[PDB]
Amino acid sequence: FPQRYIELAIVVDHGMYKKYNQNSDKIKVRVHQMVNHINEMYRPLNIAISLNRLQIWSKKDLITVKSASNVTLESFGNWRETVLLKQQNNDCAHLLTATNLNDNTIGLAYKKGMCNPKLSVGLVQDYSPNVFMVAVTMTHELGHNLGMEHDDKDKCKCEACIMSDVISDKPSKLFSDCSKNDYQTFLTKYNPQCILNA
Ligand SMILES: [Zn+2]
């Protein structure tokens, strides 16, 4: 895998702001540890994730965060294209929410959306006190932005690789051969030009 670089914007909604008792510091330690974990998991693919911006919605949410994860994701996507990309540019943005999403969904993202002004977006729920667990979900969702599918464990031969549809009790920090071929195919076939330079 040739070197790639993602400028990632992470935005924390108001609900998560109140959960951590309005403490930005506490939010920031969580977010930097997460970025460290993500980079750790993306190292074998030669992708460098750089936290280009952390926006915490402390006054109020700038979009209505709804339990329906696909409706929230789409609202966020437009807000990125429409507002966020106008102030500071980034290759991808993920919303971290404390909101309980419908049907035990803890994360959602647009497949092959990397670099797109509307689609390079993702959503993950701060569902665990453990930063590593929330970081595995963010890595997984980032995996979909980069064209990765779930693992058909049967033929991918992995039980708890990053792309398993259900997050394991003890996720491994590894990508399956299947995920690597998908990412390889993403680069080859779509080649997002925004991730070429650092
Ligand atoms: Zn998934």
From Swiss-Prot:
<feature type="active site">
    <location>
        <position position="141"/>
    </location>
</feature>
<dbReference type="InterPro" id="IPR001590">
    <property type="entry name" value="Peptidase_M12B"/>
</dbReference>
<keyword id="KW-0479">Metal-binding</keyword>
<comment type="subunit">
    <text>Monomer.</text>
</comment>
<feature type="binding site">
    <location>
        <position position="140"/>
    </location>
    <ligand>
        <name>Zn(2+)</name>
    </ligand>
</feature>
<keyword id="KW-1015">Disulfide bond</keyword>
<feature type="binding site">
    <location>
        <position position="144"/>
    </location>
    <ligand>
        <name>Zn(2+)</name>
    </ligand>
</feature>
<feature type="disulfide bond">
    <location>
        <begin position="115"/>
        <end position="194"/>
    </location>
</feature>
<dbReference type="InterPro" id="IPR034027">
    <property type="entry name" value="Reprolysin_adamalysin"/>
</dbReference>
<keyword id="KW-0873">Pyrrolidone carboxylic acid</keyword>
<keyword id="KW-0482">Metalloprotease</keyword>
<keyword id="KW-0862">Zinc</keyword>
<feature type="disulfide bond">
    <location>
        <begin position="158"/>
        <end position="161"/>
    </location>
</feature>
<dbReference type="GO" id="GO:0006508">
    <property type="term" value="P:proteolysis"/>
</dbReference>
<dbReference type="GO" id="GO:0005576">
    <property type="term" value="C:extracellular region"/>
</dbReference>
<keyword id="KW-0378">Hydrolase</keyword>
<comment type="similarity">
    <text>Belongs to the venom metalloproteinase (M12B) family. P-I subfamily.</text>
</comment>
<comment type="function">
    <text>Major venom non-hemorrhagic metalloproteinase.</text>
</comment>
<keyword id="KW-0645">Protease</keyword>
<feature type="disulfide bond">
    <location>
        <begin position="156"/>
        <end position="178"/>
    </location>
</feature>
<dbReference type="Pfam" id="PF01421">
    <property type="entry name" value="Reprolysin"/>
</dbReference>
<dbReference type="InterPro" id="IPR024079">
    <property type="entry name" value="MetalloPept_cat_dom_sf"/>
</dbReference>
<feature type="binding site">
    <location>
        <position position="150"/>
    </location>
    <ligand>
        <name>Zn(2+)</name>
    </ligand>
</feature>
<feature type="domain" description="Peptidase M12B">
    <location>
        <begin position="4"/>
        <end position="198"/>
    </location>
</feature>
<keyword id="KW-0964">Secreted</keyword>
<protein>
    <recommendedName>
        <fullName>Snake venom metalloproteinase trimerelysin-2</fullName>
        <ecNumber>3.4.24.53</ecNumber>
    </recommendedName>
</protein>
<keyword id="KW-0325">Glycoprotein</keyword>
<feature type="glycosylation site" description="N-linked (GlcNAc...) asparagine">
    <location>
        <position position="70"/>
    </location>
</feature>
<dbReference type="GO" id="GO:0046872">
    <property type="term" value="F:metal ion binding"/>
</dbReference>
<dbReference type="GO" id="GO:0005886">
    <property type="term" value="C:plasma membrane"/>
</dbReference>
<dbReference type="GO" id="GO:0004222">
    <property type="term" value="F:metalloendopeptidase activity"/>
</dbReference>
